[PDB]
């Protein structure tokens, strides 16, 4: 009876096709008791009634943990003009009103965490102070309307990109941006969400990040290629041994389209079957 938790995302629309909530019980069936959302808009997940959601992950012995939600500008219908991407002192109150509604529905859902995970536009050190800055004000935004974990952020591969000058540019030249992040972010309103695959495809090592900043780490996202184990990539032995001796208590299984053919639920399975019979997840 291990505990663990799935980014619903992995599943893609395969978990809204037919019955949900015979969906959300196969959830269940497969080995998994905590779940972190995706697809949150206006107050429903997926198209869903959010509480008519919860309810029925509920009544199958899921719980709701965590939720991915991204800053939109509601004023546009299409779903990605509608995306704010290029943060400014001028689109601040803007994402501070997103903050606010979004982190009202996810206390309601009673959600503990609530987390960002895409990178808005940086390219440079300043864009990347202005949105540390967004992000430490969001956290303010987030525990006011009583989510107490406050801003968790998730990272791709990009925020290891660095921002280097002219006068500045294998050898390494100029700052990663994600070194930044956990820099100029206030450790007491900011946390991070760890996706340790991303982390490989951003040529850094997430056992060193763990080591290195045991205290701003608090999340994981395991994650491989497709099914876990099935690639030359991930040492999830190290990986587990270094969350436990962190005390980090929370992860989620993520699995991308899968490559061969292959349904969701499918890979999905053999994700919590590895877990389940690797000696080092307890
Ligand atoms: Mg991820």
Same mark, same amino acid.
């Given at each position: 009876? @291990?505990?663990?938790?799935?980014?619903?995302?992995?599943?893609?629309?395969?978990?809204?096709?037919?019955?949900?909530?015979?969906?959300?019980? @196969?959830?269940?069936?497969?080995?998994?008791?905590?779940?972190?959302?995706?697809?949150?808009?206006?107050?429903?997940?997926?198209?869903?009634?959010?509480?008519?959601?919860?309810?029925?992950?509920?009544?199958?012995?899921? @719980?709701?943990?965590?939720?991915?939600?991204?800053?939109?500008?509601?004023?546009?219908?299409?779903?990605?003009?509608?995306?704010?991407?290029?943060?400014?002192?001028?689109?601040?109150?803007?994402?501070?009103?997103?903050?606010?509604?979004?982190?009202?529905?996810?206390?309601?859902?009673?959600?503990? +965490?609530?987390?960002?995970?895409?990178?808005?536009?940086?390219?440079?050190?300043?864009?990347?102070? /202005?949105?540390?800055?967004?992000?430490?004000?969001?956290?303010?935004?987030?525990?006011?309307?009583?989510?107490?974990?406050?801003?968790?952020?998730?990272?791709?591969?990009?925020?290891?990109?660095?921002?280097?000058?002219?006068?500045?540019?294998?050898?390494?030249?100029?700052?990663?941006?994600?070194?930044?992040? /956990?820099?100029?972010?206030?450790?007491?309103?900011?946390?991070?969400?760890?996706?340790?695959?991303?982390?490989?495809?951003? $040529?850094?090592?997430?056992?060193?990040?763990? $080591?290195?900043?045991?205290?701003?780490?608090?999340?994981?996202?395991?994650?491989?290629?497709?099914?876990?184990?099935?690639?030359?990539?991930?040492?999830?032995?190290?990986?587990?041994?270094?969350? +436990?001796?962190?005390?980090?208590?929370?992860?989620?299984?993520? /699995?991308?389209?899968?490559?061969?053919?292959?349904?969701?639920?499918?890979?999905?399975?053999?994700?919590?079957?590895?877990?389940? @019979?690797?000696?080092?997840?307890?």
């Amino acid at each position: 009876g @291990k505990e663990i938790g799935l980014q619903i995302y992995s599943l893609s629309q395969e978990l809204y096709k037919g019955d949900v909530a015979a969906n959300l019980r @196969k959830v269940k069936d497969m080995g998994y008791s905590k779940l972190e959302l995706a697809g949150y808009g206006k107050g429903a997940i997926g198209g869903v009634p959010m509480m008519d959601f919860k309810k029925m992950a509920e009544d199958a012995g899921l @719980k709701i943990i965590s939720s991915h939600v991204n800053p939109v500008d509601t004023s546009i219908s299409d779903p990605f003009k509608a995306m704010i991407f290029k943060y400014s002192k001028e689109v601040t109150p803007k994402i501070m009103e997103y903050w606010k509604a979004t982190a009202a529905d996810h206390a309601k859902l009673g959600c503990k +965490y609530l987390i960002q995970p895409m990178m808005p536009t940086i390219t440079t050190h300043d864009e990347a102070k /202005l949105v540390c800055d967004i992000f430490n004000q969001a956290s303010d935004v987030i525990k006011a309307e009583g989510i107490a974990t406050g801003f968790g952020y998730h990272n791709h591969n990009m925020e290891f990109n660095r921002v280097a000058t002219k006068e500045q540019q294998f050898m390494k030249v100029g700052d990663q941006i994600y070194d930044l992040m /956990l820099k100029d972010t206030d450790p007491s309103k900011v946390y991070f969400e760890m996706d340790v695959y991303w982390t490989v495809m951003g $040529q850094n090592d997430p056992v060193e990040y763990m $080591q290195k900043h045991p205290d701003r780490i608090k999340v994981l996202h395991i994650k491989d290629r497709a099914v876990f184990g099935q690639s030359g990539m991930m040492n999830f032995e190290m990986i587990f041994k270094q969350m +436990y001796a962190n005390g980090i208590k929370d992860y989620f299984v993520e /699995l991308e389209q899968m490559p061969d053919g292959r349904t969701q639920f499918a890979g999905v399975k053999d994700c919590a079957d590895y877990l389940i @019979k690797a000696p080092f997840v307890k």
